[PDB]
Amino acid sequence: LVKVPLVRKKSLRQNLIKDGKLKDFLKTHKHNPASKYFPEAAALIGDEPLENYLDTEYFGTIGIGTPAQDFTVIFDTGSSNLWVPSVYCSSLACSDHNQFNPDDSSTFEATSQELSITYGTGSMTGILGYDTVQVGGISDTNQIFGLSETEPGSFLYYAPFDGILGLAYPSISASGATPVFDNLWDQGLVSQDLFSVYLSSNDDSGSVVLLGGIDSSYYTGSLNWVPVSVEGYWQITLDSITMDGETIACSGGCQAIVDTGTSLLTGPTSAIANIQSDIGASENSDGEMVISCSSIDSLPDIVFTIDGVQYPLSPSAYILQDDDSCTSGFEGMDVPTSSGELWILGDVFIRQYYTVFDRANNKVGLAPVA
Amino acid sequence: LVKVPLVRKKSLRQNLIKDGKLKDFLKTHKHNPASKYFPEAAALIGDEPLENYLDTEYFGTIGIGTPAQDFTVIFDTGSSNLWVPSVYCSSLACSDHNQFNPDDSSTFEATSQELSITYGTGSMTGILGYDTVQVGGISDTNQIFGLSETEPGSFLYYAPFDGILGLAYPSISASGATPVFDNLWDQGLVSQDLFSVYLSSNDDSGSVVLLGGIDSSYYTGSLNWVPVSVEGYWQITLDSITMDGETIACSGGCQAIVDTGTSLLTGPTSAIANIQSDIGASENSDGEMVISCSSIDSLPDIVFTIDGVQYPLSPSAYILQDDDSCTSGFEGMDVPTSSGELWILGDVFIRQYYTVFDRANNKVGLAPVA
């Protein structure tokens, strides 16, 4: 099977905290994760184009060119472009990162098409080029990708990743560059038009992106299939959210986006504040909603109901445990008033439920991890 | 007299060259100095807001707050705002720079007015505040200034200055913040509504910004007064430019801007290419138009005719000599097609001609340095 191993690393947020750089950032900027999903919510001050990747924790490796140049990338179901830093990226933030040198690859083909990539909090520009991308042992020929050249914001310097590899639909791809998965399928390089993600528990190694297959070894029970409600992001319909039997959000149903680019459950500010207080989370000096590790066993499960099946999350799942340091896996966002209630199901969710992304039938399948 | 001593330091360009960072920049950006003077010429890619300060060489010191916090600033006749980096500037580029901490000053007064400063190649944002600025021994009370908070571009990291102090008319001041000189005069803190600049020869110390006075010790002969042709920048009318008796540019007259924020004579691309070839200048791998130091004595003078008086520049004046390394003091620019021929008279010019900036009568006075 084609497997891309994923490694769990300390997030960009954890690195900013460690370098004492986060408090200042937060003082002068308002962080709203909703900006990654809605044009309307784009950041007032776009000087940190990678702000929406503060909480990413899993990364994989890809090689580009002939011979291959390696890069650490985020496998992001919440975006659809592939980009890595160009060797022409002179920014201080590009230092200490793997950079692509087009002149070292005999299969690289330049284009004069400009790339403008934005995740709702500023843009990065570069150029589009074509090369062979090595992903999971497959040689993805003639893959169009972006080469980032302009200032990427100081956050790149502290990021454990060099670029991003988008797994969403082509309709949200910047400059209509073809996404990697689409290119794989169009070329007959994968068995089926689907991919699955398995995240191992407790920062273990064993996590993988499975391209073109479903592996019964990673789940128990049967897979529940849910239709994609709006094609763009991997968006589905949620029936309700309960805590201790009580409905606490998504009353009457709501939308949810499955996003591997974030480790947290993100929802409306008000619903989230309720939950944080209920679980005893408290914001420290840095951004952090800390919780006592010792109180975990006293918390209730949060239950997501999807297509009539119940998906409970126990406290051990929704509380991030960094040796003796525990943080809440919930984060709030403000979506356009236009927009209905929206929840983001990130790694906390996926680590408990093996997920299948079916492009042939436009459905998401879920089952409890084995 | 109120004198602000100026020190000649290696430029930002020299520092980028030294750190091997310039070739890449130039590969991905087109540098057009005209962007500092015309909205219409603003940069396609604004990721380096301080690009137009690559060639600045003279700097002074100012203190801000109670007790004073010191900063190295450019005294720029080509701009009108005063700004320094805020302690809240978290960017990697803000490191190693003096930063203003509002909480350390008992006379600081915050405003909720945002500052957007641009010199034609990207913006920096922050907030406007009021404090006492110490300039040349004078206590400039209730001075409004900007506190830069967002990414300033990687160039700030290599810049020998922390901020900029604009000496142009208020009509080009961003956010209508009052310029320092205007504030000085409005408060009766200077003798007269004028200032003069004396640049000593051969990177000597002795250079000064003279606030409210004219000192006959710095020039010989009489001062020639020229009216400001358009109030905004210190803009005057040029009658012609000759080289070896031949008219080489500004035939029939043209405009000139006196700009202490740059060390070079800047003019139309075509006229400049002609001159570079005539003097034997050649662009090296870095941006640089190098000239053999040994050929100086064989070059002709370039003559600027202003209000009928001749202002010759000998080769020793128009050739920058950095120990055994000589560079051409000419640089080209592309002004809006709308616009007529425009020349920028920077430090090469001012080092030979003591300059007086008269705000009371809207005139510029010139005389050969003593």
UniProtKB/Swiss-Prot annotation, chains A, B:
> Secreted: is it a keyword of this entry?
yes
Its UniProt entry gives the catalysed reaction(s) as:
Preferential cleavage: hydrophobic, preferably aromatic, residues in P1 and P1' positions. Cleaves 1-Phe-|-Val-2, 4-Gln-|-His-5, 13-Glu-|-Ala-14, 14-Ala-|-Leu-15, 15-Leu-|-Tyr-16, 16-Tyr-|-Leu-17, 23-Gly-|-Phe-24, 24-Phe-|-Phe-25 and 25-Phe-|-Tyr-26 bonds in the B chain of insulin
**Disulfide bridge map:** C89-C94, C250-C254, C293-C326
Q: State the compartments where it is located.
A: Secreted
After translation, the protein is modified as follows: Minor amounts of the active enzyme occur with 'Ala-58' at the amino end.
Q: Which positions fall inside the Peptidase A1 domain?
A: 58-367
Spans traversing the lipid bilayer:
none
Instruction: Quote the protein name from its UniProt record.
Output: Pepsin A
Q: Which organism is it from?
A: Sus scrofa (Pig)
**Span within the entire protein?**
60 to 385 of 385
